[PDB]
């Protein structure tokens, strides 16, 4: 009836037994913080303990180092720094020695390394860590777990610490990340850890994306990963393409034409909602980037000089293959649920609106054919899609250029307000609402 014992009771179904174990652990953090942490790290560090215990130990440690409330988190980070340097040097030592000794997933240690580091790195307090983390991944003998859990830690560190505090280590890290991502890596799990790590390290690899030698390698590595048979790795890989596109638009010429287009397009068509979700996000991101450019460009028009960066109108160039997919995606309607849920359908529509405000006028002639063919369809889905799509293109094409179209639509737009389907009725309403509003 020790600590391992109290920890395991933190998952016991018995309500009384839980609040019990919980109270114990709370005072322990209050009246015995330094010791408590060294003990928990000792539990976590021992591969002889239950997954139940280790994970619990890890959760307690991580809980005394961070919170989602910036204020609380600040308070915890300070409390930790105020702890004896030798106690901390021991917790750090154990937490670290854990990496590569866990059989369960994810790693419960990486969450602790990321916890302590977020408090200690911004103060040059654990200057050894990164070198250690990088060596763990790049050692030619490192186990399949050594790389995976280390990459998860590197990943969490990048995710929660100011990227401003890693640019001076950006090359070391990136090497370790790209290392667990290259196809030669046997494990997709390591490949998965590596890919989510990269996703949070883009913020400070700007110096690396600038060197064409390296940007071509990163991009190839990411691309080969959108082809991974493990859906998770794919989605993670597509997630990078989406962020790379908003953080490095100016360098996408080389790949966009011969690679991205194909990948993202197919992704949008995937049967797997999470993958389709990424494809869409990617082209919404493009419209966004391209819209701010149209501004930055127009602003330089007044100042009679050229803008810093120029748009390449990738969005307008894909209008041909995007529109049909987006409209088709609006067919994947949610009969039953959450008008709060983010499914491909919700995505597509928001995307379309973006595509509209982007390829302003040239959006209508591509959307109409779908609206026409379906506005009067037996399937409530297609009937709603048509009414939906019409509601999306409303804001983009010239206010004047639209009015005539609104002329011929208005009739049917009203009928639908009396359509059986509550969904269609709701949609029709929204659409008609936008009309009366915008174009007086």
């Amino acid at each position: 009836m020790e600590l391992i014992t109290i920890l395991e009771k933190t998952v016991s179904p018995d309500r009384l037994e839980l609040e019990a174990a919980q109270k114990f652990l709370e005072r322990a953090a209050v009246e015995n913080l330094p010791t408590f942490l060294v003990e928990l790290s000792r539990v976590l560090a021992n591969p002889g303990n239950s997954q139940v215990a280790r994970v619990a130990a890890g959760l307690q440690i991580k809980n005394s180092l961070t919170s989602k409330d910036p204020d609380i988190k600040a308070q915890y980070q300070q409390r930790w720094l105020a702890i004896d340097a030798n106690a901390r040097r021991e917790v750090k030592n154990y937490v670290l020695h854990t990496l590569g000794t866990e059989t369960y997933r994810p790693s419960s240690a990486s969450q602790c390394v990321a916890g302590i580091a977020c408090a200690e790195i911004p103060v040059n307090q654990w200057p050894e860590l990164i070198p250690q983390l990088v060596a763990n991944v790049t050692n030619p003998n490192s186990t399949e777990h050594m790389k995976e859990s280390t990459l998860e830690a590197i990943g969490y560190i990048c995710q929660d610490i100011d990227p401003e505090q890693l640019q001076d280590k950006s090359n070391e890290i990136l090497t370790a990340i790209i290392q667990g991502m290259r196809k030669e890596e046997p494990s997709n799990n390591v490949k998965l850890a590596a890919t989510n790590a990269l996703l949070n390290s883009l913020e400070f690899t700007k110096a690396n994306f600038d060197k064409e030698s390296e940007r071509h390698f990163i991009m190839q590595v990411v691309c080969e990963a959108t082809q991974c048979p493990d859906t998770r790795v794919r989605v993670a890989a597509l997630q990078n393409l989406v962020k790379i596109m908003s953080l490095y638009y100016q360098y996408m010429e080389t790949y966009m034409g011969p690679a991205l287009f194909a990948i993202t397009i197919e992704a949008m068509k995937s049967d797997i909602d999470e993958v389709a979700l990424q494809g869409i996000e990617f082209w919404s991101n493009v419209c966004d980037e391209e819209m701010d450019l149209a501004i930055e460009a127009s602003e330089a028009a007044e100042q009679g000089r050229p803008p810093e960066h120029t748009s390449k109108f990738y969005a307008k160039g894909a209008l041909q293959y995007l529109v049909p997919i987006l409209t088709q995606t609006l067919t994947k309607q949610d009969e039953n649920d959450d008008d709060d849920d983010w499914n491909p359908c919700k995505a597509a529509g928001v995307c379309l609106m973006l595509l509209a405000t982007c390829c302003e006028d040239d959006i209508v002639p591509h959307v109409l054919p779908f609206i026409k063919e379906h506005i009067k369809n037996p399937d409530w889905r297609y009937r709603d899609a048509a009414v939906m799509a019409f509601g999306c293109i409303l804001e983009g094409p010239e206010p004047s250029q639209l009015k005539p179209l609104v002329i011929q639509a208005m009739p049917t737009l009203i009928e639908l307000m009396k359509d059986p389907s509550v969904v269609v009725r709701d949609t029709a309403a929204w659409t008609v609402g936008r009309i009366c509003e915008l174009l007086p």
């Binding site: 330094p34 010791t35 060294v38 004896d84 030798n86 106690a87 040097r89 021991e90």
Partner: peptide, 4 residues
Amino acid sequence: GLFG
């Protein structure tokens, strides 16, 4: 360490 933690102690002494």
